[PDB]
Design a protein around this ligand. Structure first.
Ligand code: F3S
Ligand code: F3S
Lengths: 129, 386, 386, 131
């Protein structure tokens, strides 16, 4: 069990997909598909839809929060977001899209493919082995 | 972050999904910068207005918020709009219209301090455009952070901001001294100087010595550039800034700007006239005497421009140029004054290929878009123009 | 007053009868207030525009001076014009033309700090009308004497004023401390307080404790009112004015303004609605938020006015309220935004016999001229009106 | 003989007959620019002319445009031959300059009464009393 902060509540379980690079939503993620578009992200072609996203911090344009909202309408949104440090772009996106977010977690202890449960109301991540 | 018993009810949801989710945003930025409480704001400025930058995901959000009843509780204006073919404009008018339904002054200028909205010294506000923020903090003494698109709107809805950063006295103290040893006399000089200081400085609050600007527009540009090659949200000029007396309260380092520093920037923006098919002045949006200058210059030239000149301006300024006769002198020589639009934020990529300008901000963004650019003063751009 | 060798050429007519006489006036003033030298001004505002004021005598000098070859050497704007029958108006436009022929920006407003000419903190200027001078000095921290009509014109032609009075750091220091115990929160309350403080003070520079105005416009009013009843060209509001920390530099007496003081002025301008055939809002010239206030007020009234409503405002503000649909709303109900004009300076004694207003300045002048007056906030005025 | 010393505001010399007022004269609407007849609600002097007389008064008051009334006065020849103010403010000195009306201030106006013949050397700020 890894402990973090309650950014946005809710509970979710899914497949962990990890980025070790600052991820920028305006440009680097497609609102229609959920596929990463960033030229040099780890997951150049992987889609976020219905997964558990892990990445150190968001970056890029303040507008990126709106992309995350389009992902949630277009139903290609992640089930939950695990950031190293919660910032304005990603948190606002989860707040307006009702996506559960928990930051301050050791994101290095999460590798791609892990089955994982996030209780975002209390801000805790549990790895299922 | 402390919340008054009224504020927790807005978060509890008493006043609608709109104010709740807006308050939810705010209490998340406060919990990021450690604001003590929420402080009220006297005005706002919402970023994310161009269809180029907010796209369809933009009109997505704004559609659903207009639906759930979001209105702004404090007087607020808009970032500039874009310019494009009639598809782009329809979507652009949709964006403007959606903001209008939220009770926003659809002024769409980066210079609301001309006519539209002029903050008083010491007023806490929630502004978002970088060039406009640099003006409010440095040249007017008003206090605002460099807000984002969604946060400027979220603050505009509730009427408050997290109390952090540039709202607090101690974060308005200078962090570095800038000994401007170079010759800095003209608009382009303050353009090319701001490009430098902005690029070499971090998140600093620079203090300028040896800087006597003749026109306040020079400091409008000096701030716009630093906010484009860096993140300078507030600077002090000795003897010219309203907060400059109490600025330096501890031992500061002094970087100096030599002429070689400014020359290097000039020569990275020296493209031939044969690579230019547009002149842009008014970035940030021209003041009235800026428009006056350009008109009196086309006077002496006496022949029209064979590549088109654009002056991007607030509608306030554009209106005076109309009524004072400056526009008629401009449109007669192929110029045009574009109210409340912005060019570095319009999908102009297919239309033009080279921008001559006097703005350091425009030069930097157009160069990094792939356009050829040629940076000089307005008097030179108009003399040598085709 | 020390004169440069060039200034002492101009004094000897080396540059024309127009510059000579301009310089001749400026040295007579320096010799009266013991100014050390002539300081350059960055802009200027010229008084003596309405034909009711300067009259045929005014046109005579203005005419001979333009024929002598007078031209302004710095960016200068104008004071508001008059309104009257077309026989009058034809004469007025002759005044405005002469000023134009001198190179003046014909913007005819007392709020040029909205779009037209926004001075920077510490700029030395030559402004001429009381409400503007108080605003630029107090709320902007720029420096200018309460120049007269001719003194500002000469200062605008040479490009310099005598360096006396409010141009000097020691003269901007506070004279009295004003403790406002009375309830002062509405626009009209700052009108009525400015009335009282100007009438009871002398040539003081007050220092306001316990004053926290919501809208900057309240201080725009506050200064204007004090400039009518008294002779206040500069004040300080603790926390709101940019110069307030350095204002006090010795022991000062504290005068106090109680609710009894203010009621006695609110109640002096309460003539019946049946003696009121006109409403003036926009003294000083309304801001855009002031107009937007009046617009949304009539939308909730539903029905038009049976007496005319007049919103005097700068050209810049009008053209905003036009493009934003505010003047379209204001005109559907019986209202009109009158640009770049002023009523207290217009020969309207035979047109209307009673003004209702939210301005304390107009309430003061119109009462003395012999009109019925009625002083209240716009929200109350628009509701109660016929 | 009894020379009264004052300050130079506008040069020139002028002799002639006096009119004196111990009240702040206002020049905007206080003097009819056609006649030079003093028309002010409050005044020592109402309905008396100024043309070709030495105008002794304590200070100018009223509106700053009054200088133009003086400029019109002079070009109508209904202006005073000279002006002995006690204290030079910006209304009357400005009007003297644009009108080329010889002016002197700083004189003790109590030693002047209405009717006394006088010459004013304004180049030197002097006031001889011809008898
Ligand atoms: S938004 Fe405005 S400040 Fe300049 S870069 Fe564009 S014209
Ligand atoms: S000039 Fe302006 S300040 Fe009031 S008295 Fe006239 S509207």
């Amino acid at each position: 069990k890894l402990k973090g902060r309650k950014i946005v509540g809710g509970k979710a379980e899914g497949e962990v997909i990890v980025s070790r690079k600052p991820l920028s939503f305006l440009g680097g993620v497609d609102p229609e598909t959920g596929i990463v578009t960033d030229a040099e992200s780890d997951i150049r072609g992987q889609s976020i839809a219905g997964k558990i996203l892990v990445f150190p911090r968001g970056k890029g344009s303040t507008v990126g929060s709106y992309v995350i909202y389009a992902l949630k309408k277009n139903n290609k949104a992640p089930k939950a977001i695990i950031v190293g440090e919660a910032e304005t772009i990603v948190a606002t996106g989860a707040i307006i899209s009702d996506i559960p977010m928990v930051d301050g977690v050791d994101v290095s202890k999460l590798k791609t493919g892990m089955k994982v449960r996030v209780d975002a109301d209390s801000g805790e991540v549990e790895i299922l082995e | 972050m402390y919340l008054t018993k009224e504020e927790e009810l807005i978060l509890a949801g008493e006043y609608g999904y709109a104010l709740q989710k807006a308050m939810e945003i705010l209490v998340a930025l406060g919990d990021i910068y450690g604001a003590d409480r929420l402080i009220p704001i006297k005005s706002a400025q919402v970023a994310g207005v161009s269809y180029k930058n907010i796209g369809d995901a933009g009109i997505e959000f704004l559609r659903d918020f207009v639906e759930a009843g979001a209105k702004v509780s404090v007087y607020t204006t808009l970032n500039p709009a874009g310019i494009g073919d009639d598809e782009f404009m329809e979507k652009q008018m949709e964006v403007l219209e959606l903001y209008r339904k939220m009770g926003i002054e659809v002024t769409s200028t980066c210079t609301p301090y001309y006519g539209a909205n002029l903050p008083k010294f010491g007023d806490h506000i929630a502004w978002s455009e970088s060039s406009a923020v640099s003006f409010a903090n440095s040249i007017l003494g008003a206090r605002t952070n460099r807000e984002g698109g969604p946060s400027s709107l979220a603050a505009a809805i509730v009427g408050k901001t997290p109390n952090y950063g540039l709202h607090l006295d101690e974060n308005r103290k200078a962090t570095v001294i800038v000994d401007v040893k170079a010759k800095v006399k003209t608009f382009a000089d303050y353009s090319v100087l701001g490009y430098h200081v902005g690029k070499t400085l971090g998140n600093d609050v620079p203090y300028f010595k040896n800087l006597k600007p003749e026109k306040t527009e020079f400091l409008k540009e000096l701030g716009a550039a630093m906010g484009a090659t860096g993140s300078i949200a507030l600077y002090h000029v000795e003897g010219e800034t309203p907060e400059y007396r109490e600025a330096i309260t501890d031992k500061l380092e002094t970087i100096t700007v030599e002429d070689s520093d400014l020359k290097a920037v000039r020569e990275s923006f020296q493209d031939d006239w044969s690579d230019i098919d547009m002149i842009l002045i008014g970035c940030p949006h021209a003041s009235l005497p800026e428009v006056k200058e350009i008109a009196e210059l086309l006077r002496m030239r006496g022949k029209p421009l064979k590549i088109p000149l654009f002056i991007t301006a607030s509608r306030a300024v554009k209106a005076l140029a109309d009524a004072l006769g400056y526009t008629e002198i401009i449109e007669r020589y192929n110029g045009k004054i574009i109210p409340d639009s912005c060019f570095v934020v319009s999908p102009i990529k297919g239309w033009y290929r080279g921008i001559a300008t006097n703005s350091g901000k425009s030069a930097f963004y157009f160069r990094s878009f792939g356009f050829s650019v040629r940076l000089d003063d307005v008097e030179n751009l108009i003399k040598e123009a085709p």
